[PDB]
Symmetry: C2
Subunit: 207 residues, 2 copies
């Protein structure tokens, strides 16, 4: 196998789907690429470095609404950007967990700066613009993680009684398991955006 | 060491703080309790069972605003409950990650049902009541996870250039690292609540 950056990442992503984040080891990556371990080490030093790179690559490859379009409202941008962020996390097993704890990479500086400038140009303080951005990110990460892990632990865990469930909770579970969690995510997303709009609009008024 | 349920959990939580979720093994738990492994197995069958129990115990012990007070508004309850949920997750290393993927335990049925009944009594459909509840949970889990993991990976990861940072992003990072992430969480929480209020209020009106 070829051992440049692109090829290693490609093989690491494939491996992530097969084994998940817990079972993604340097050993298994060397076996996957048909090489001895000291050969891999030349290229990739440890698991952390691998994961940091994957976090950046997943967004680079699949997160395609990272910038506002010409004349787009801040409401719209946040919605579209949240939707894009969600898809990209979803495309790989444990994708959301690969993201967790990372900060913007050098490769992402210009992009993330532009998002901050863009909010402030629309009348947000840097601070409220940051909070808006952060709340969308967190809401989105949380939604995705609960479902990615729920579906993962579905193997080991018993399942669910269903018999001695109370009636609202029973119907609640049927509703969350209906779809991705997409509905609940899109509805919760709108609440979040409208609340930022009410905050911005009010200015110094008591609200 | 005594080996009942209470004692095992107590020792498992202590261990979780020392090693985190990744390094919490049955082997190390047997060494911690001064026992051989087949002795532990009698009591605790595997890691998953352990973790499921911890998830439930952390909330039982430290999540103290799980119910509305007499005559409390739905706005207030959601706020207080989110704040309580956050603290409880924060009390242990990887606490939020211990929660992830779990569903309400038998021990939590009555409590979670009451929360659903409570929203519907305030004019939510079961469905919008569920979504409100879920969005708060996800927002809260996401916020906590990003900071718990950020602080964890702070050991392995280089750090941050700081030199070639763009200016808004530079000041953004100084702002998020100012505190827990508490400020950003509490502000994002208010936006979320007000947005649910706008949705509920409007009824069948276009909004
Ligand atoms: C944070 N608040 C909103 C609630 C809560 O306080 C408790 C609790 N035990 O007190 C919880 O169990 C809670 O944190 C929690 O984890 C929940 C769930 O996991 C959950 C609920 C309802 C439905 C699903 N579901 O997936 O279908 C859930 O995963 C109830 C919510 C209620 C959540
Ligand atoms: C989801 N939207 C809102 C943004 C985004 O689309 C990108 C991106 N590269 O396109 C991201 O890098 C993003 O997902 C992301 O992970 C971010 C961060 O990790 C992040 C940001 C600003 C500040 C911090 N911080 O901790 O201080 C962050 O952790 C920018 C946001 C912008 C986030
Ligand atoms: Cl080749
Ligand atoms: Cl090569
Ligand atoms: Cl004893
Ligand atoms: Cl005993
Ligand atoms: Mg991020
Ligand atoms: Mg839960």
């Amino acid at each position: 196998a070829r051992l440049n950056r692109e090829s290693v990442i490609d093989a690491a992503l494939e491996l992530l789907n097969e084994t998940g984040i817990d079972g993604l080891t340097t050993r298994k990556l060397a076996q996957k690429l048909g090489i001895e371990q000291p050969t891999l080490y030349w290229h990739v030093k440890n698991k952390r470095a691998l994961l940091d790179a994957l976090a950046v690559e997943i967004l680079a490859r699949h997160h395609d609404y990272s910038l506002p379009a010409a004349g787009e409202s801040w409401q719209s941008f946040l919605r579209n950007n949240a939707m894009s962020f969600r898809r990209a996390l979803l495309r790989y097993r444990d994708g959301a967990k690969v993201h967790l704890g990372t900060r913007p990479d050098e490769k992402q500086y210009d992009t993330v700066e532009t998002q901050l400038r863009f909010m402030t140009e629309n009348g947000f303080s840097l601070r409220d613009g940051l909070y808006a951005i952060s709340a969308v990110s967190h809401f989105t990460l949380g939604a995705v993680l609960e479902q990615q892990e729920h579906t993962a632990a579905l193997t080991d865990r018993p399942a669910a009684p269903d018999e001695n469930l109370p009636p609202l909770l029973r119907e609640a579970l049927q509703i969350m398991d209906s779809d991705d969690g997409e509905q609940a995510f899109l509805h919760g997303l709108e609440s979040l955006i409208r609340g930022f709009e009410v905050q911005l609009t009010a200015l110094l008024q008591i609200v």
